[PDB]
Amino acid sequence: DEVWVVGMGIVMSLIVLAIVFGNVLVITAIAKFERLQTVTNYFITSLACADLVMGLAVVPFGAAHILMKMWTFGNFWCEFWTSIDVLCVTASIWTLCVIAVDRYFAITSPFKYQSLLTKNKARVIILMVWIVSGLTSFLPIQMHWYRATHQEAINCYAEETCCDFFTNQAYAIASSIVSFYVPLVIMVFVYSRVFQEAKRQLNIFEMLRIDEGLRLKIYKDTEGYYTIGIGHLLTKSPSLNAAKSELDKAIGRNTNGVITKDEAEKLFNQDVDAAVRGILRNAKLKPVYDSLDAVRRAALINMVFQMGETGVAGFTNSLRMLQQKRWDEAAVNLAKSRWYNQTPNRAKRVITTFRTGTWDAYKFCLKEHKALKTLGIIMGTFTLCWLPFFIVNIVHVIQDNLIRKEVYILLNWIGYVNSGFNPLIYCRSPDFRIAFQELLCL
Ligand SMILES: COc1ccccc1OCCNC[C@H](O)COc1cccc2[nH]c3ccccc3c12
Numbered sequence: 001d002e003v004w005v006v007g008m009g010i011v012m013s014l015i016v017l018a019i020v021f022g023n024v025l026v027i028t029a030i031a032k033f034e035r036l037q038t039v040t041n042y043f044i045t046s047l048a049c050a051d052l053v054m055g056l057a058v059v060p061f062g063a064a065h066i067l068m069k070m071w072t073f074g075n076f077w078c079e080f081w082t083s084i085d086v087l088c089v090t091a092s093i094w095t096l097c098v099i100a101v102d103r104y105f106a107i108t109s110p111f112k113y114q115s116l117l118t119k120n121k122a123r124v125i126i127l128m129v130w131i132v133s134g135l136t137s138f139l140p141i142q143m144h145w146y147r148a149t150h151q152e153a154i155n156c157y158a159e160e161t162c163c164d165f166f167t168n169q170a171y172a173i174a175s176s177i178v179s180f181y182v183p184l185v186i187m188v189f190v191y192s193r194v195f196q197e198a199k200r201q202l203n204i205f206e207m208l209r210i211d212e213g214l215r216l217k218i219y220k221d222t223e224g225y226y227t228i229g230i231g232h233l234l235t236k237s238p239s240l241n242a243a244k245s246e247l248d249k250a251i252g253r254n255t256n257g258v259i260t261k262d263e264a265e266k267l268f269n270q271d272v273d274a275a276v277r278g279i280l281r282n283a284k285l286k287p288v289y290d291s292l293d294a295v296r297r298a299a300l301i302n303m304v305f306q307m308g309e310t311g312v313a314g315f316t317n318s319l320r321m322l323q324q325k326r327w328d329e330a331a332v333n334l335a336k337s338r339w340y341n342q343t344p345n346r347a348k349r350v351i352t353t354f355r356t357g358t359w360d361a362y363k364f365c366l367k368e369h370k371a372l373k374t375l376g377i378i379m380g381t382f383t384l385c386w387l388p389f390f391i392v393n394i395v396h397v398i399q400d401n402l403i404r405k406e407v408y409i410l411l412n413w414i415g416y417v418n419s420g421f422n423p424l425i426y427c428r429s430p431d432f433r434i435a436f437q438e439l440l441c442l
């Protein structure tokens, strides 16, 4: 039809523009901004190069093929075009696999969120993934190892006006598992483990950094009291020079209302120390502390750190319920307090920790954990986009007549649109948002 060809022509043209512009933005943001020049972001540029090659050299020739219902670029470009396509998909899932293994080694090391690779070794890995994927992609195609022997396939290879990627059943099976299924199984197994590690490595220091935050300049809390660092109360007095003198005596330097990150962490270690010492020194808190597990012990310190040893000791009925290990009944009474009404988003997190004895309420709150969720989304959307195509790819090897050519090409295009989604997922990071609004002069 005449309205279908123009209507699909316009939407294909918008897909091509969105892939190219989005991916040049990612590549230049990392190239110009020092904050973004990290090992993880070098792997993300490997991924954005494949998406840019897909946008310029792969998607436009696939778009022309559908609108013209024929191949108008000759038998040479047909084989070269299929090779670049295969290479772009192969290098993409293998780099996602490398990101999963790299994040695993980081999360199971004392450095926790830093790669154990140097920026020089990361470049070698990327060139190694690009050279090997080049051999497995260009070589079987240009050597015609992929080629089917039935008459419909044989005639298509001869005529310059035909470019249907016919393959023998042995190539279709072998290249699908080595190019896609092998790195996909490793990535989902290894990255389900990084999430597990992140949640089970959460401590009281990371818990309070989520709840209190981190500010290196004097500010007023909800009580209008002067605070600094990770919830360090300076004074209840409404006087900034009286608050600035309390800093100077605590640090032993003319601070001038500003603290360095190394100084604020020293103040926080002292504050959590005073909290735990206040508990075992109190006759009402010590027995409730002794009857609690490591994570519920964190929830009780969190409370003493915020309201003081004497304030938490006033929660007699709630404390009695925690001692008897009756979490839901402890929760009803804790929720029926002024603590809950004043700071409810922090109170329901501490109350949920008491109900479950898990770190589930503190899940994907830390900046470093939000970063691991973004990577997981990039990984997940790619697999959702390409798995229907790769499933019907091996099903066609089982039974030929099971699926029509129309569904095969539509499921391939769902994979093609993925090449334009990744820049949009990078907007979850504030570092990328800042570079993008700068590059788009907003
Ligand atoms: C069929 O021709 C097309 C017409 C219009 C639009 C797209 C078209 O598709 C062109 C080719 N698409 C390639 C696919 O987009 C990429 O498919 C692969 C990627 C990586 C390894 C692979 N191993 C395999 C073994 C058998 C078949 C496919 C693959 C494959």
Ligand SMILES: CC(C)CCC[C@@H](C)[C@H]1CC[C@H]2[C@@H]3CC=C4C[C@@H](O)CC[C@]4(C)[C@H]3CC[C@]12C
Pocket: 042, 043, 045, 046, 049, 050, 053, 084, 123, 126, 127, 130
């Ligand atoms: C169709 C084919 C020929 C085009 C493929 C382009 C190749 C040459 C591209 C794709 C991915 C690219 C790499 C992506 C990541 C980096 C990190 C950067 O810090 C140094 C360069 C390096 C290592 C790039 C070098 C060039 C590279 C390997």
